[PDB]
Amino acid sequence: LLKPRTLADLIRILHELFAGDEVNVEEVQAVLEAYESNPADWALYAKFDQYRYTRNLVDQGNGKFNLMILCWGEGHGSSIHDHTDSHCFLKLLQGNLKETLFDWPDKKSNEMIKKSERTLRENQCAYINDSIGLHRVENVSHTEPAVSLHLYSPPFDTCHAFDQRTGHKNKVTMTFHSKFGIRTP
C-alpha cells in the first residue's frame, strides 16, 4: 500500500486492491485518504451544472467498481439514499460537504430522523454501506462549490431515494453527466 502521487497512480493501486473477490475496506479508505487532491489531475472531470450536482465517470474498474467525480454547486445536495448493497467510499477533492446519517425506516409511515451529521473537509474520506445506514450529502456553502471522488463496489445503476417525512422510498436511475471527460447526450 503506497501513497498515490496522482489520480492515475491512485487508479492503478485501486485496480490492484480490487483484483480479488473481497474488498479490504480500511485499505481502500486509507489510500483514497492518502491521495492529496490536485486539481490539475481532475479538472477534466469537474463538469458542473447550474441546477444540481453532476456525476462524472472516471473509471469502470474492470467491472469491479465505479469511480466517479461528483460536482456540487452551492446549495446542491442529494436525496436521502441507499447504495444498493455496495460499498460506498467518498473522498473530498475540494470544498466541504455535510453528510447526514439516517436509519432505515420502519415500515410504518413516520418522519425519518437523523442519527448524526458531520462535515467532510478537503481530502477526508467517508465510508458507508446499507448495514451502516442511509445518508444525504449536501454542499451547504453559499460561496464555494464542492468536488468529491466516489467509489462504489459492486457498481450499480439504480438506488433508492427516501422521503424524509414518511420513509417511503422510490427507485432512482443514476445519470451520468460525462464519461471519461466526454459529456453525455
Q: Which residues contact 3 (CB under 8 A, 6 or more apart)?
A: 31, 34, 35
Nearest residue to 96 via CA among 67, 80, 75: 75
Chain CA centroid to CA 23, Å? 17
Q: Is 135 annotated as a binding residue?
A: yes
Whether residue 150 is annotated as binding a ligand: the answer is: no
Give DSSP secondary structure letters for 97-134: EEEEEEPPPPSS-----EEEEEEE-TT-EEEE-TTT-E
CA distance 134 to 144: 25
Q: Is 81 annotated in some ligand binding site?
A: yes
Q: Which positions make up the binding site for Fe cation?
A: 81, 83, 135
Q: Which positions make up the binding site?
A: 81, 83, 135
